[PDB]
Amino acid sequence: PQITLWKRPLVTIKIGGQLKEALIDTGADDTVLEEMNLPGRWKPKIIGGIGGLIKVRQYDQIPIEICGHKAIGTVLIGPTPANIIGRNLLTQIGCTLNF
Amino acid sequence: PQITLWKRPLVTIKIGGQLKEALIDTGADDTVLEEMNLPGRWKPKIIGGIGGLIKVRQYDQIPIEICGHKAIGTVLIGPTPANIIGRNLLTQIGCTLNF
Ligand SMILES: COc1ccc(S(=O)(=O)N(CC(C)C)C[C@@H](O)[C@H](Cc2ccccc2)n2cc(COC(=O)N[C@H]3c4ccccc4C[C@H]3O)nn2)cc1
Numbered sequence: 639p640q641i642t643l644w645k646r647p648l649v650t651i652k653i654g655g656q657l658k659e660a661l662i663d664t665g666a667d668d669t670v671l672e673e674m675n676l677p678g679r680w681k682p683k684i685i686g687g688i689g690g691l692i693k694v695r696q697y698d699q700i701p702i703e704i705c706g707h708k709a710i711g712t713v714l715i716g717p718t719p720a721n722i723i724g725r726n727l728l729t730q731i732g733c734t735l736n737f
Numbered sequence: 738p739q740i741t742l743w744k745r746p747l748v749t750i751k752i753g754g755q756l757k758e759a760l761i762d763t764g765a766d767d768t769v770l771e772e773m774n775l776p777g778r779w780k781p782k783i784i785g786g787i788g789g790l791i792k793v794r795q796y797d798q799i800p801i802e803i804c805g806h807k808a809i810g811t812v813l814i815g816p817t818p819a820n821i822i823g824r825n826l827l828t829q830i831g832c833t834l835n836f
């Protein structure tokens with residue numbers, strides 16, 4: 639799709655066997671979701687934003703599908719107030735900014 | 738232009754008579770910059786990021802330019818770890834997401 643920014647850029651993200659809504663966030667290096675079930679093992683990571691740092695759970699090799707486009711990559715789980723899709727997965731679906 | 742996301746989408750912004758680099762940040766509702774001078778009066782605002790809330794200074798009707806593209810809007814100044822350009826200004830320059 640071509641998405642304008644008058645409203646938050648919400649999309650549907652297929653992950654695990656479930657649908658979540660998340661923001662397309664070009665400001666985010668990484669994808670960070672609120673608490674959810676993901677399969678497999680995880681490792682610790684600290685990430686930082688406005689407000690400061692947080693610790694998250696890092697799950698690697700997680701398949702995802704955004705609006706019909708498939709990808710795979712690392713997904714972080716932790717206390718973010720918003721599900722956000724970051725550049726690590728946006729590149730894989732071909733997402734660009736344009737003006 | 739078309740900007741991909743293999744790296745941070747950094748672009749220069751002219752504001753307050755100066756040049757600054759900032760991140761095009763489609764997850765940001767508002768534009769938030771690191772401490773700098775801006776003219777006129779400011780009002781208080783509280784915004785929230787991944788790691789809690791911070792206090793910022795709100796400056797209205799600030800002219801800004803991005804890749805030749807001129808706009809005007811509200812600019813927040815505060816303790817952000819990164820200069821970010823948010824949707825309030827991105828819409829004004831016709832910036833969209835595409836995939
Ligand atoms: C009222 O308007 C607002 C405008 C911006 C913000 S935001 O909190 O800054 N935000 C909202 C989010 C729900 C989409 C935007 C966002 O892109 C921030 C960008 C940011 C990151 C770091 C400092 C300030 C702003 N964001 C992204 C992330 C997730 O990624 C990591 O933490 N990233 C790392 C990283 C990414 C960008 C810049 C610096 C760094 C620190 C690294 O370790 N968390 N918040 C809040 C309100």
Ligand SMILES: [Br-]
Nearest residue numbers: 691692693717
């Ligand atoms: Br934490």
Ligand SMILES: [Br-]
Nearest residue numbers: 710711712726
């Ligand atoms: Br990745």
Ligand SMILES: [Br-]
Nearest residue numbers: 718719720785
């Ligand atoms: Br939020």
Ligand SMILES: [Br-]
Nearest residue numbers: 729732741742
């Ligand atoms: Br590409």
Ligand SMILES: [Br-]
Nearest residue numbers: 743744745746
């Ligand atoms: Br980078």
Ligand SMILES: [Br-]
Nearest residue numbers: 754755756757
């Ligand atoms: Br300058």
Ligand SMILES: [Br-]
Nearest residue numbers: 756757758759
């Ligand atoms: Br700069």
Ligand SMILES: [Br-]
Nearest residue numbers: 783784785786
């Ligand atoms: Br906020």
Ligand SMILES: [Br-]
Nearest residue numbers: 809810811825
């Ligand atoms: Br505005």
Ligand SMILES: [Br-]
Nearest residue numbers: 798809810811
């Ligand atoms: Br204005």
Ligand SMILES: [Br-]
Nearest residue numbers: 829830831832
């Ligand atoms: Br335009």
Ligand SMILES: [Br-]
Nearest residue numbers: 642643828831
């Ligand atoms: Br438009």
